[model samples]
Target chain A: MGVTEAQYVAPTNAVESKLAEIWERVLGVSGIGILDNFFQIGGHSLKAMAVAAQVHREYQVELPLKVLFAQPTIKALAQYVA
Target chain B: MSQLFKSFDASEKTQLICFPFAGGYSASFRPLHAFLQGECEMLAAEPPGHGTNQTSAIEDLEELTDLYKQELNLRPDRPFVLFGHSMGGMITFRLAQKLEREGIFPQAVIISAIQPPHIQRKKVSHLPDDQFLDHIIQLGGMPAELVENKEVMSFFLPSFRSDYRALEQFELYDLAQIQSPVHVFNGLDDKKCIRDAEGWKKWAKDITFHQFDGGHMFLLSQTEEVAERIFAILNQHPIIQP
Candidate 1:
């Protein structure tokens, strides 16, 4: 539900920060916060696949594409990965 | 019993070798078979990894293609045509190339709901179990209620995963140019399919495109209309045996 630049909450930890950084680079957006929705921030199937691949490479975990879609926010994804 | 094809045969009628869509069984073409009864012989491929064929699904397109060619010992004395939908479109195209390479030719090769080889495919096979099942529902052919039943759906998930993996990994390079007229069809609302569909024309000398009124599964939903039109097209290139 958090949509704009105003209600933004920044990433607290290294996992959250790394996920936020990855999303920003892949999705080409600035100020991607912990609670931001991936789809809401212009994420698509192709982009999600790319992000999932990068996540696997970064964390050495096989994060499925659906998991990324299910927990789109940086905070939720970071928790899953952690 | 034919290992690869389920056929309704008539010696007088020319064979129409049909390839099913992804996750589609040879029996799935029954409606088209019903419509063209007596007028044409339907030799629908069961393929490996799903349906009645017990063989595990082959993920490599060329491997599957080579198997089809081997099992389908088409006699030069008999006339035949080819038809495929979605993933089948890729096989039909490849099969046509292989046959033509051996100096064999079909009356026509028909395909629906897929783009040419050059079009890139989005990778989705890495999403297994929960994540994979959720994403699979977006595809047209998977029945909504059936997918709702997770237990029943699990039986087919492996095959579905294999098909998409095969499709994503598939490579179609320049081969023998098709001498047969290529008839390609698309659903008007099938955005990805219609987008790069014009590319199908590149492989053949004579290519004609057709469209129906619905989305990707239009071939299944509007079987009567599809079969009728297919029957008409089959008649157009009057069978010259061999």
Candidate 2:
């Protein structure tokens, strides 16, 4: 069976939508809500590393791994990014 | 102190074998090698497809481990210790295990910036080129000039892919604790390596875990200090002659 889609929770802004989109691609599960923990749904160090790198590429802002681990969920990260 | 030690003091009679981080060649440890100052004859094992081994076809970790063992065994006269960073850490850990089965135990093992072997996680090397590059950048410390230049990326990407592919395929079989004491170090800011540090105690007789003043890619800036610490520890635990 294909990986099932996650329950959809529309992002509140462009920052969140962008993060959610990356999360979806990296985590391999769609419909990610802002509060979803990157680690909760099969996020590990390798993926977390990728997420931080990709975020920097997209935004041209440095996102350290410590920050990524601290603000794991999309909502927290989105706020941090903003 | 600046030259990368490939084979300095070849007859120093003790071995400090270094394995490089992922996408890294033996030359990558130039700073650490230089700081070591002939404390031990340094041998940086270059993985396939890079450095002097650039012409070699890249192999997965298991194969690489066997290949390394043969090279090491060729010089049975020198007692040795293993040090590895990032993917190199994983290689040395497994290499130690393989050596142990042959009744060959390293004096010690130093692992840096890698999660313990038992911790299963996804691998990014096999991902599409774009995603793989993204992950490398995310891990931090890629020179900005290289990141911005397509020509450089093109030259380096294949080695990265080979290293990552090897990592993806690596497995920790026969999970027995090794005889060597393990020294684990990571960037204080590198949460992932720190998180995985505690798990290493399960793999060795004794482990001294250290958190230094940097992040995931901290070794470059603090090479001298890190080398000094490694040197001190090796002196404290002098190799028992056969």
Candidate 3:
């Protein structure tokens, strides 16, 4: 709950890296770590949607749009696709 | 009721003009109109293929905005503000911009249950009938009872699809701040706006956000509270004259 902008929790696997890559592209910010909260890092409803869609295209996992809100970090999202 | 607009009240110090959500008719605001009686005048608009305009529907957002501007020009001048939900919210947004350019300013723009337009969404209108209906039903505005009423949907699909097409097609010119104060409301339980209502902060110079205790259609369930808040907001702000 207390995620900070400067925190650096690097991705531990490929799924996390994929999520981070899409997150960085959608959010226009680089160096997003596995633990960085999407909303805390400036993701909102629209960006969340974009992220959901890109993930679908990338993994064909069809993540529900709601997931981006509750499970917003690369770690949490990776777990869904893992 | 004209196909495009209906005035719920003719006499009040302030007029609150409204647009309906996708596939909504002008009558959608009737309950709110009843609740706000004596507090303000209320008006609601219906797009083509909706309400009395059931014969045909318009798919162009830009065209609808232009038509609405003309309809408004014929009306007598009065103090007015704008309120819209979802697709209607997008309509009010474009209307506000068009009006500002023409020097006609609404007192305030109050939007509910819609995300900031800057972000592109998955286009659903192009989906096959069942798939499209599936998505809309999941989004929850059509009401549970009407979900499978084939008779009702016979009258619903055209307008709903048209509205979604228009809403999805239209894009904001920019996130440039508008002159009017923007009041955004979201349901705490509705992910649509809860996660995105703050996005409006970048688009409106003077903006405020509110949260209600329900889902996307929270305004209807919490009509009294929402009306009170809107009444209070209007008391604080009114249409800006260019």
Candidate 4:
């Protein structure tokens, strides 16, 4: 299931930027970048749900908590944030 | 499939004992246990007011901390970390304080989704039933129909309501200096927690703040990711030799 080639890997720009906005707004940490890591900034499960719920409520996107975990980095999570 | 764990054993490397927030129970940590099943033995503090002992009233965080210390029979073989959420977060902080006083402290303390002890919001103690129930609904910690179902509501409201009182009535003294590192977790969308997580930096001289993708009920929503984050923290700390 892993994409080995660089060309095969999709770009995470749009999703990363969108998640940055969501992360900043939901977590109250301003200036969150696309490359930022979630837990290093001090997020826990409850806060994750808040962000997930808001993402669903706001974007109408279903982001599984597992997806959030598997993609801890904003760039990595960009694929699913949409 | 969801798993419910009553007990776990891990070779003396590190242990994390978790406590639940208001309207929470032992089962609240089921996914946490699943996430950290191999590296650490995770135990949920079976506090009164939920699960098998749902009939009992919720106690103040102080007494609850004492009860946790007693029930868990914490020893110093491997380092221990206390993780608490919302009200449980406060309990873990105080429990760390209590452990420090007794010359026994966990390697790290994880405080999530809670305001600092010194900070006070509007107290929920005197609110009417309708208003009180509204607060629970907003947290998304309980179901709506449970509010009206007598059988379910019977097991639900008392602990949730009392936990609100216990949390609101909590008092903080000049905290003794804790050598242990403190980690704070907040939901990015949590208006209250974003305000609350900021206070954690000043509370612990050695503190790290992490923001996750969920909200107040993020604990339930983002269990595995949270566990992985904790695992990273535990592995990084030298005091916690795995």
Please provide, for model 4 over B85-175, each residue's C-alpha lDDT reduced to its tens digit, 9 standing for 90 to 100: 3222222344454444354433354433333111123233233553443333334322223222331111112222233244344434333
Clashes of 4: 27
- For model 2 the local lDDT of residue A53 reads 39
Encode model 2's per-residue lDDT on B1-242: one tens digit a residue. Answer: 01123443444633443333332223334554667765555445432211342221112223334555665544343233444332212223444434433444343543333331111132432335434434344444333332223311111122222332443444353323643465544322333332343334235434454432222233422343553444344333333213
Worst 10 residues of 1 chain B by lDDT: B151-160
Candidate 3, residues A28-75: lDDT per residue as tens digits? 364434464655444223322332333333322334344343443444
Assess the local accuracy of residue A77 in candidate 1 as a C-alpha lDDT between 0 and 100: 37
lDDT of 4: 0.35
How do the residues B1-242 of candidate 3 rate in per-residue lDDT, one tens digit apiece?
A: 12344343344543333333322123334454667766553344443221353311112223333566666544433333444332212223444434433444343544333332121222332335534433343333222232223311111122222332443544353444644565544322333332343234345544454432222233422343553444344333433223
Off by over 4 Å in 2: A1-82, B1-5, B8-39, B45-97, B100-107, B116-182, B187-209, B213-242
Provide TM-scores for the models. 0.30, 0.30, 0.29, 0.27
The local distance difference test score of model 3 is 0.35
Q: Which regions in candidate 1 have their CA more than 4 angstroms from the true location?
A: A1-62, A67-82, B12-40, B47-79, B88-93, B105-113, B117-182, B186-209, B212-242
The global C-alpha lDDT for each of the candidates, from Candidate 1 onward, is 0.35, 0.35, 0.35, 0.35
Cα-based lDDT at residue B145, candidate 3? 32
